[PDB]
Amino acid sequence: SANHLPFFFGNITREEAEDYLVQGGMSDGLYLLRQSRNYLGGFALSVAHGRKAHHYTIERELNGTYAIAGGRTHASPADLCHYHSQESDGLVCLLKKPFNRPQGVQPKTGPFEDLKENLIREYVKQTWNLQGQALEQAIISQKPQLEKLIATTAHEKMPWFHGKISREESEQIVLIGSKTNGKFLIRARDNNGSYALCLLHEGKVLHYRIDKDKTGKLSIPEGKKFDTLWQLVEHYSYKADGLLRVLTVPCQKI
């Protein structure tokens, strides 16, 4: 329920947040809120101070409170922003002026966010045999648990996920058809938490390892850490960030 904040931009990138702060004058204490792109249920706070951008991850704690690492918990991202408008409490500066969404600009949603509500609805309907207002009351009654369940499993039916197939199989399926640069898929390996990203670069198939660390966080070695595979694909579809190129078209299943 951060959509109600006029300075919440949804799923924009660090770079887009920095472009918006520049457009807003880059004044000390100028700030906006965005959806975290690598922490599930998380937000990011982007603040101008000393003509630079400062970015803070606001995690959703186990108990449904919100905190920057090393900070007190708050009931909501709104409360955290209100609090940091009064007390710096370790932040680079006080939150002075929200940069609001310019007229007509909505919170950005990504591909997962567009499927989320329908996937939660269809799961509750099939699992619990509910319809109409009963169905909506169920969804609302367990929204946080349902959001978590659907986010951790949504990749299974996304077009770029090919399940447990071999290295050799993945090369064959990627090399069939038009050799579109950035054509990609993700496959499961042995360890139930390990994956590979398969990416077409100038007619060659690149294999990048995706490992689950002790937190449950997914990363390519030396790469940004994500709670989910769909976060990883959205990131590497926006910029290469260490890959030889950006992900483009999902490799169709057979």
Binding site: Y56, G71, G90, Y208, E222, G223, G242
Partner: peptide, 18 residues
């Protein structure tokens, strides 16, 4: 080198409160 490695280094550093 059966798996490709990331090139460069990450310039995505978040600030925190301590």
């Amino acid at each position: 080198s059966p798996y490709q490695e990331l090139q460069g280094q990450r310039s995505d550093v978040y600030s925190d409160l301590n």
